[PDB]
Structures are given as structure tokens and as C-alpha cells.
Structure 1
Amino acid sequence: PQTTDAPAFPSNRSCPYQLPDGYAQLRDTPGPLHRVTLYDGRQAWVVTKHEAARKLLGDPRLSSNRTDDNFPATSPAFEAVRESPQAFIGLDPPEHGTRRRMTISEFTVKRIKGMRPEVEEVVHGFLDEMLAAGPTADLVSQFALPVPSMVICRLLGVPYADHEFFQDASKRLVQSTDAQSALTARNDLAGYLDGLITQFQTEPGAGLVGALVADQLANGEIDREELISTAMLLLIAGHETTASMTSLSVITLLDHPEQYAALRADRSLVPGAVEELLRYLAIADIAGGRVATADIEVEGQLIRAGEGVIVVNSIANRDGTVYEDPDALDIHRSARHHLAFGFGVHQCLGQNLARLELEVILNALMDRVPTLRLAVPVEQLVLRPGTTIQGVNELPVTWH
């Protein structure tokens, strides 16, 4: 018999908005932790319950150091991160805070509020274009990706004129199935950002990269390679997460037409619906990895120093002790306290930007394209694997 008490992890989704069978199994198994086997045969722990996930994400004994040999890499592609200097996502205190603080001023509530006109312009512009062209369209390449791309590039000071290059590099990295393809995509982006830094040293300019070059880099308070990695992190996260939330939300909303109609009739529901979609779709388990630097006892189970732990926020978000009937999409529920953005010192820096983008995107689609519908059946879509950010390669749509 082939039964194991340490199942292969991660698993791939067969439905965009449902837990893989293996994950539903882990969700139902008692206790905060479960053993899994990673692609390389190493055993790690997964965290599968909501409160335990918050506790462990808050535990400084669980390090985010991706350069540690014992870090729970889930594919050969993940060997691209550990090669070059880490952005603050891969740092622990105190280095984490000193670096994160260099970027936080771009993401304040006041700044995000001030960005609304820009986001609305960008959303409606790419919609103007896609709609004028007429159906059939790929919602991913014509809308879901370029919108957040343009927005984050403005925030960063990355010239949108180079979009074909850096969007392809982003796409290659996210779709990477091996180490060499990931390393090449990373190096391509790194060289591009390196040249941008030199350009800023000659001629100062707007955007976070411009500011970091003029200030911290000029004071030697950040390494050039660290600045590259930081800009890269913000660029890729800025592009890829919102793109996936857009595509998957459209698919999910169209599969729940009663809720989608309700959303259209009462736009005050949009912010709450965005939270529920974030909870339900939980696109970023790829960002729950940790390595124990000391023994941690968790409700009778022992995590040993040197063991990998992955906090699986999609499974945690389906904890029925927190969300009644957790596998039901309910745009009227309180999806508050969800872990789609993590918890603690590494909680998503871009979360409020993401929330603004998704609110504007959903309102715009309901306003401008009320007849939007998929042009192929949901079953024909190709979902990305559990080793990357959740999403679809392409999303064929049509409308009146």
C-alpha cells in the first residue's frame, strides 16, 4: 500500500476557488500541524488551522531566512531567491524593519487614498481599449496584468515604456518550472533594475526607486543589490498578485451569479466582497515558508530547530471554527481576520493598494461591462500549480 502520514506538498487546484482534495484532507485532520513531504524528499510541517497560523507567524523562532539550507523550498525554481541578496521579505529583525521602513511611506492610508484617481484612470483606460477592440479578449493580458503593472511602475518610478521586457520577465519567473528558467528571469530583471539605478544616479527622478537611490543608497544604508532585490519584490508582487485576484475573482463571481448580481445592485458591498474573495481565493501559500531557529512546542507537537514550516493560509482561511461553512463563498459574511495577506511583521505591505485596485476593478467591470461572461467553460481553463502564485495562464471573455 502507498498510504503516507506525510503527503506530498504542495497540491494543485482543480477548481480556481476550491481547496485541492489533499488540502481539504489536511483542513479536516485534527491539530495545528501536519507532516508533509516536499519535492526533494525532505519532510516539513504545514500549519493548517487559523489561530495556530497567527501564533506561528508571530513567533520570532520561525525565521523568514530563505538563504538557510533548511528553508522549505517547494520547487527547484525556488532556488532563484536564495542565490542573491534578500529583500526584506527574506529578512528577520532587526534587518527586516530597517529595510521595510525604507518603503512604507509609499503605502500609507493617505497615499493609497490619494492614488484612487490614478487607479481609476488606469482601470478605465485599459477597459476603454479592450472593449473598443471588441470580443473575444484575454482578460489576463489585456486587463488583469497591465492595470496593476502600470500602477506599481508609477509608484516605483519604473518606466512603463519597458513593460514588454519586464512583464515578460515577471511572467517567466511566475510560470517557471525549473531552476535555470527562474534564475534567468531573475537575472534579466536584476540587470534591468541595475541600469535604472545608474540612470537615477545621473538624473534623479520620482518613484520609490528614485528616492532610495538619492537617499539610502547615497548614504550606503542599503546595498545596491539589496535595492535591486527590494524593487524586484515590489514590482513582481505589485504585478502578479492583483492580476491573479482579478482573473480568479471574475471566474468565481460568474460561478456565483446570485452573489454577483447582488454585488452589482449594492456597491457598498464591494469592500466586504473583496475581503471574502481574498479569504476564499488565498492566492499566496507560496509565501508561508519559515525555518525554526529553536524548538517550538505547538499543542503537544514539537517543531525542532532546523525544521521547515509552511503556514498554509488557504487552508487556515477555511477553518470552520472561524468562518461558519468555510467552503461557502458568501460576500455578505465578515471575512475579517483572514490570513490571505499573512500576519505579523511580514504582513503584506501592499494589502491596501491591493484592496483599492480590486474595488475599482470590480466596480469598473460591473459598470462598463455588465454583460461580461467567460468565452470558454471554467473546466477548459488552465490553473497555475501550487508551487507558484495561484491564477490562470489566460482568461477568454466576451460581452455585448
Structure 2
Amino acid sequence: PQTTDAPAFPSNRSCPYQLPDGYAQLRDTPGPLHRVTLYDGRQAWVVTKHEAARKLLGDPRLSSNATDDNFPATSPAFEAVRESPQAFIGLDPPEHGTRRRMTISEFTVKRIKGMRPEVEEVVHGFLDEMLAAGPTADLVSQFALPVPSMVICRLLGVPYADHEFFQDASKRLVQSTDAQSALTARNDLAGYLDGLITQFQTEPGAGLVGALVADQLANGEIDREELISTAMLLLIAGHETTASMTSLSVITLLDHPEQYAALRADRSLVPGAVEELLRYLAIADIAGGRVATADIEVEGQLIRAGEGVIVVNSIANRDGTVYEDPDALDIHRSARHHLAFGFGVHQCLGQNLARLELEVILNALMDRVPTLRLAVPVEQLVLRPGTTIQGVNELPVTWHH
């Protein structure tokens, strides 16, 4: 027999908004942890329950150090992370905090509120272009990706002019299946960001990157390579996550036409619906890799120092002890406390920006294209595999022209 007690991980979605069969199995298995086998044949733990996920994401014994030999890399591409200085996503206290604090001013509640008119302007701008061209469009390339790309570019002070280049490099890096393809795309982005830094040293400019160059870099409080990594982190997260959420959300809402109509009829529901969609879709479900620096006992199971642990937030967000009937989309439910953005010191920096963008996007689509529908069968869409940010690279849509 082929039965194993350490199943291959990650697994692929076969339905854009449902756990892969293997994740459903792990969700159903009693206890906080379960053994898996990574791509290289090393075993690691996955965390498969909601409260245990919060506990372990809060445990300083679980390091985010992606350079550790025992870090649970889920594919060969991750070499692109371990081969350069880490952005703060890969740091632990105290270095984590000193780096994260250099960026937090761009993401304050007050700043997010202040970006509402810009995000609304950008959303409607790309809509009026898409709709003026008329039906059979790819929602990914024409809307889902350019909108948050333009927004994060202004926040960072990266020229939107260069979008074709950095969007292509972003995709190759994040979606690469092999180490050399990842290293190249990372190197391409690095050289670009490097030139931007030098440009800012000659002529000060707006945006976070400009601010970091003029201040912390000039004081030697951040390494040039760290600034590159930090900018690359924010550029890619700023783009890809919201893009993925937009496309997946349209697919999922259109498969739930009853709740979609309800959303349209009562816009006060959109913020809650956005939380439910974040819970349900969990697009960064394997962005929870850690390595134990010390033994950790977990409800009778022992994680040993030097063992890898992945906090699987998709599985955790389907914990029925927390979300009653967890596999049912319900935009009226309280999706509060979900783990789509992590928990603790590395909890998503961009979360409130994501929430603003998705609220504006949903309202705009319902306002401007109420007859939006997919132009192909859900079954014919190609879903990205489990080793990356979840989503689709193409989304054929049409509407009443």
C-alpha cells in the first residue's frame, strides 16, 4: 500500500474557493499539527487548527529566518529568498522591528483613509478604459493587476511607466517552479530597484523608497541590499495579493449569485464581505513558514529544535470550531479573527490597504458593470498550484456592451 502518515505538501486547488482534497483531509484530522513531506523529501509540520495557529505564530521559538538550512522551503524557487539579504518578513526580533518600523508610516489608518480618493480614481480609470473597449476582456491583465500596481507604485515612488517590466519580473519570481528562473527574475528586479536608489541619491523624490534613501540609507541604518529586498517585498506584495483577491472574489461571488445580489442591495455589507472573502479564499495560505529554534510542546506533540513548521492559514480558516459550517461562504457571518493575514509580529503590514482596495473594487464593479459575468466555464479556468499565491493568471469576462 501507498498510504503515508506524511502526505506530500503543498497540494493544488481544483476549485478556486475550496481546500484541495489533501487540505480537507488535514483539516479533518484531530490535533493542531500534522506531518507532511516537502518537495525535497524532508518532513515538516503543518499547523491545521485555528487557535493553535495563533499560538504558534505568536511563539518566538518559531523563527521566520528563511536562510536557516532547516527552514521549510516548499519549492526550489525559494532559493531566490535565501540567497539575498532578507526583507523584514524573514527577520526576527529585534532586527525585524527596526526594519518594519521604517515602513509603517505609509500604512497607518490615517494614511489609508487619505488614499481612498486615489484608489477610487485608479479603480474607475482602469474601468472606464476596460468598458470603453467593450466585452471579452481579461480581468487579470486589464484591471486586477494594474489597479493595485499603480497604487503601490505611488506609495513606493516606483515609476508606473516601468510597469510592464516589473509586473513581468514579479510574476516570474513568484510563480517560478525552478531555482534559476527565480534567481534571474529576482536579479532583474534587484538591478532595477538598485538604479532607482542611485537616482534618488542624486535627486530626492517622493515615495517610501525615496524616503528610505534620503534618511535611513544615508545614515547607514539600513544596508543598500536590505533596501532593495524591502522595496521588492512591498512592490510584489502590494501588486499580487490584491490582484489575486480581486479575480478570485469575482469568480466566487458569481458562483454565489444570491449573496452577490444581497451585497449589491446593501453596500454596508461590503466590508464584512471582504473579511469573509479573505477568510474563505486565503490566497497566501503557505506564507507561514517557520523553523523552531528550541523544542516546543503542542498539545502532547513535540516540535523539535531545527524542525520546519508551516502555519496553513487556509486550513486554519476552515476550522469549524471557529467558523460554523466553515466551508460555506456567508458574507453575513463574522469572519473576524481569520488568519488570511497571519497573526502576531509579522501580521500583514498591507492589510488595511488591501481592505480599502477590495472595498472600492467591489463597489465599483457592482456600480459600473452589474452585468459582469465570466466568459468561460469556471472549470476551464487554470488555477495556480499550491506552491504559490493562489489565483488565476487569466479571467475571461464579458458584460452588456
How many Å separate the matches in 1 of 2:216 and 2:80? 26
Q: Deviations over 1:313-351 (max 9, x none)?
A: 000000000000000000000000000000000000000
How many Å separate the matches in 1 of 2:53 and 2:119? 33
- What are the ranges of 5 or more consecutive residues in structure 2 without an aligned counterpart? none
Q: Deviations over 1:346-383 (max 9, x none)?
A: 00000000000000000000000000000000000000
Q: Deviations over 1:172-228 (max 9, x none)?
A: 112211111111000000000000000000000100000000000000000000000
Q: CA deviation at 1:78?
A: 1.0
How many Å separate the matches in 1 of 2:227 and 2:387? 26
How many Å separate the matches in 1 of 2:6 and 2:146? 40
How many Å separate the matches in 1 of 2:289 and 2:192? 28
Q: Is 2:286–2:313's contact at 8 Å kept on the other side of the alignment? A: no
Number of aligned residue pairs: 400
Question: Percent identity among equivalent residues?
Answer: 100
Q: CA deviation at 1:171?
A: 1.3
User: Partner of 1:254 in structure 2?
Assistant: 254
How many Å separate the matches in 2 of 1:211 and 1:80? 26
User: Partner of 1:209 in structure 2?
Assistant: 209
How many Å separate the matches in 1 of 2:173 and 2:245? 18
User: Partner of 1:357 in structure 2?
Assistant: 357
Hey, which bits of structure 1, 4+ residues long, moved more than 4 A? none
State the superposition RMSD in angstroms: 0.4
Q: Deviations over 1:94-132 (max 9, x none)?
A: 000000000000000000000000000000000000000
Q: Deviations over 1:245-264 (max 9, x none)?
A: 00000000000000000000
How many Å separate the matches in 2 of 1:286 and 1:336? 20
- Helix, strand or coil for the counterpart of 2:212? helix
How many Å separate the matches in 1 of 2:222 and 2:259? 48
Q: Which moved more, 1:344-353 or 1:162-171?
A: 162-171
How many Å separate the matches in 2 of 1:133 and 1:183? 37
Q: Deviations over 1:51-109 (max 9, x none)?
A: 00000000000000000000000001111100000000000000000000000000000
- Helix, strand or coil for the counterpart of 1:81? helix
- Helix, strand or coil for the counterpart of 1:310? strand
How many Å separate the matches in 2 of 1:197 and 1:62? 33
Q: CA deviation at 1:285?
A: 1.9
Q: Deviations over 1:137-159 (max 9, x none)?
A: 00000000000000000000001
How many Å separate the matches in 2 of 1:191 and 1:395? 31
Q: Is 2:6–2:34's contact at 8 Å kept on the other side of the alignment? A: yes
Q: CA deviation at 1:40?
A: 0.2
How many Å separate the matches in 1 of 2:119 and 2:285? 27
State TM-score, norm by structure 1. Answer: 1.00
- Helix, strand or coil for the counterpart of 2:82? coil
How many Å separate the matches in 2 of 1:289 and 1:225? 23
How many Å separate the matches in 2 of 1:20 and 1:286? 13
State TM-score, norm by structure 2. Answer: 0.99
Q: Is 2:286–2:311's contact at 8 Å kept on the other side of the alignment? A: no
- Helix, strand or coil for the counterpart of 2:35? strand
How many Å separate the matches in 2 of 1:175 and 1:12? 14
User: Partner of 1:371 in structure 2?
Assistant: 371
How many Å separate the matches in 2 of 1:79 and 1:9? 18
- What are the ranges of 5 or more consecutive residues in structure 1 without an aligned counterpart? none
How many Å separate the matches in 2 of 1:208 and 1:160? 15
Structure 2 counterparts to residues 280-319 of structure 1, below 5 A:
280-319=280-319
Q: Is 2:269–2:332's contact at 8 Å kept on the other side of the alignment? A: yes
How many Å separate the matches in 2 of 1:319 and 1:168? 36
- Helix, strand or coil for the counterpart of 1:249? helix
Q: CA deviation at 1:286?
A: 2.8
How many Å separate the matches in 1 of 2:380 and 2:174? 21
User: Partner of 1:143 in structure 2?
Assistant: 143
